[PDB]
Amino acid sequence: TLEKFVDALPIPDTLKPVQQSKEKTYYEVTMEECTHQLHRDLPPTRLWGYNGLFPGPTIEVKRNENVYVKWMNNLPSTHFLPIDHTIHHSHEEPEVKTVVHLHGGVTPDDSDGYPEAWFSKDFEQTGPYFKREVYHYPNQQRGAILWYHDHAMALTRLNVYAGLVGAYIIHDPKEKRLKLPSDEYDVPLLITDRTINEDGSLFYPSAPENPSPSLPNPSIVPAFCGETILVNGKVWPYLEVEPRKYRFRVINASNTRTYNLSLDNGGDFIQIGSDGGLLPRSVKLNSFSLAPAERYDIIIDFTAYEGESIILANSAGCGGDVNPETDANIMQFRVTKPLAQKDESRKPKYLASYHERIQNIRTLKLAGTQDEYGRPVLLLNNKRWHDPVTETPKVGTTEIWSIINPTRGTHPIHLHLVSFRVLDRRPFDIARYQESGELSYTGPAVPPPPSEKGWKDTIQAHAGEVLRIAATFGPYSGRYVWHCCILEHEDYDMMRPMDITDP
Numbered sequence: 001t002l003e004k005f006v007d008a009l010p011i012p013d014t015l016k017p018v019q020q021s022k023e024k025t026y027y028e029v030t031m032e033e034c035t036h037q038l039h040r041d042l043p044p045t046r047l048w049g050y051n052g053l054f055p056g057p058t059i060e061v062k063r064n065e066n067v068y069v070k071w072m073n074n075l076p077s078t079h080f081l082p083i084d085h086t087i088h089h090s091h092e093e094p095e096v097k098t099v100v101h102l103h104g105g106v107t108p109d110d111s112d113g114y115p116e117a118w119f120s121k122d123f124e125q126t127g128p129y130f131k132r133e134v135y136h137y138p139n140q141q142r143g144a145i146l147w148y149h150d151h152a153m154a155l156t157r158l159n160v161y162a163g164l165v166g167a168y169i170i171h172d173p174k175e176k177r178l179k180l181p182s183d184e185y186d187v188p189l190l191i192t193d194r195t196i197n198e199d200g201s202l203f204y205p206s207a208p209e210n211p212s213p214s215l216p217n218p219s220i221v222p223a224f225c226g227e228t229i230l231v232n233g234k235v236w237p238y239l240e241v242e243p244r245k246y247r248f249r250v251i252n253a254s255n256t257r258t259y260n261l262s263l264d265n266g267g268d269f270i271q272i273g274s275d276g277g278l279l280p281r282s283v284k285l286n287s288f289s290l291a292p293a294e295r296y297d298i299i300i301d302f303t304a305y306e307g308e309s310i311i312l313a314n315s316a317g318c319g320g321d322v323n324p325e326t327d328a329n330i331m332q333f334r335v336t337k338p339l340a341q342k343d344e345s346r347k348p349k350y351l352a353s354y355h356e357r358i359q360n361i362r363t364l365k366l367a368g369t370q371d372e373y374g375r376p377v378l379l380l381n382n383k384r385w386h387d388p389v390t391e392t393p394k395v396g397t398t399e400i401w402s403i404i405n406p407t408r409g410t411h412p413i414h415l416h417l418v419s420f421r422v423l424d425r426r427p428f429d430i431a432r433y434q435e436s437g438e439l440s441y442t443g444p445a446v447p448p449p450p451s452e453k454g455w456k457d458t459i460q461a462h463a464g465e466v467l468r469i470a471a472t473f474g475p476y477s478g479r480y481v482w483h484c485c486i487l488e489h490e491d492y493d494m495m496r497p498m499d500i501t502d503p
């Protein structure tokens with residue numbers, strides 16, 4: 001095992017445009033086999049990286065900036081992580097397929113990275129919903145932390161684990177007057193748990209434990225928990241900071257793992273933002289939950305802690321209780337950087353402003369059948385991906401989605417295109433719902449905590465609760481998706497199409 005806090009936190013560079021005008025910013029990003037050392041004491045690791053980087057370069061845009069990214073694939077024809085060929089059914093398609101989803105993007109459908117819009121190297125082969133090489137991101141939306149990652153059908157868990165993640169920030173100039181910490185004092189933190197072999201190579205399980213020899217090989221697993229935690233591509237790093245306010249864009253880019261984060265001296269975060277942008281009012285927190293694909297925009301105020309080492313800790317376990325010596329640790333702040341200037345940043349209470357009729361109320365169930373080989377298959381509302389679309393909201397209208405979770409565990413559910421408000425959660429009789437299909441509540445409705453009073457696009461639906469959210473669908477119409485963000489679930493098969501229609 002590996003010494004904690006011996007490597008500096010990398011901060012990914014900001015991508016430079018290939019061409020740029022008042023009217024159009026044009027970027028190129030090529031997926032490439034690359035080599036990077038993840039820890040002082042590990043041989044370098046072979047990974048897949050956007051422009052040869054892990055994590056991918058940070059992309060920074062203004063609200064309404066007219067952006068194009070040509071996402072290209074220049075990867076090997078053959079994968080280096082275990083492909084389970086039995087999970088989706090078929091001329092022969094390439095083994096390695098990729099497509100980039102801008103998670104949180106208010107995006108035209110053919111630029112949203114639909115799982116069947118995939119492509120292989122140089123776009124030689126393309127999936128049946130592919131339309132275009134150069135994706136278009138108009139960024140007509142709230143300033144926020146987005147992130148980009150692969151979304152290829154049956155492969156998402158693999159392609160992401162391989163290293164295909166990156167941050168995308170939307171800056172709204174109108175927010176500049178809040179004087180939030182910025183520039184060097186505004187730092188994204190992409191958290192990814194990994195398991196790494198002694199020779200430096202990524203370990204990803206090629207079967208669950210106790211593989212009955214009937215079971216395919218490789219076989220998909222229903223969950224992955226990495227032995228090590230990385231932030232921005234380094235195992236358990238440290239970051240030297242100035243004793244002053246910092247903003248952090250915290251992103252869970254892990255396959256399965258949920259984090260429950262705190263500072264080991266009992267100190268407080270200030271949440272200024274959720275997936276969908278600034279909260280209306282800032283919230284003071286001692287801890288916070290962070291499931292796959294969630295994003296918390298926070299301030300940590302180091303002013304009074306000059307000289308100190310503060311650990312960003314985690315108490316959520318993955319497949320067992322946290323281990324204090326390993327996954328209980330995320331990174332270490334060292335407040336030893338001299339101030340480069342006066343800290344003019346603020347941490348205001350007042351951040352943003354907070355009339356619509358309900359067109360429809362979709363009731364949706366989270367549940368799993370079981371396959372030929374005994375393995376669990378997780379399904380949204382009893383459907384497989386390939387079944388005729390059923391979630392078909394009307395452009396311009398508002399729906400309430402009530403998501404019922406009678407499973408053993410939490411699912412972070414994500415809708416593309418939209419961000420949405422959270423209404424409440426409410427517990428119910430699980431046995432009763434499974435026996436009869438009948439829903440009896442065992443307690444009142446609970447509103448969201450303040451963290452979740454703003455806009456969200458990825459939301460934890462806890463076991464034995466009904467969660468209700470509300471979304472207005474637009475401004476674009478077309479074919480999108482919704483799904484669980486635990487990638488091991490997403491790929492088998494907790495993802496469905498979502499058509500937003502127009503007369």
Ligand SMILES: [Cu+2]
Nearest residue numbers: 102103104416
């Ligand atoms: Cu998304």
Ligand SMILES: [Cu+2]
Nearest residue numbers: 411484486489
């Ligand atoms: Cu799930």
Ligand SMILES: [Cu+2]
Nearest residue numbers: 414416481483
């Ligand atoms: Cu998605």
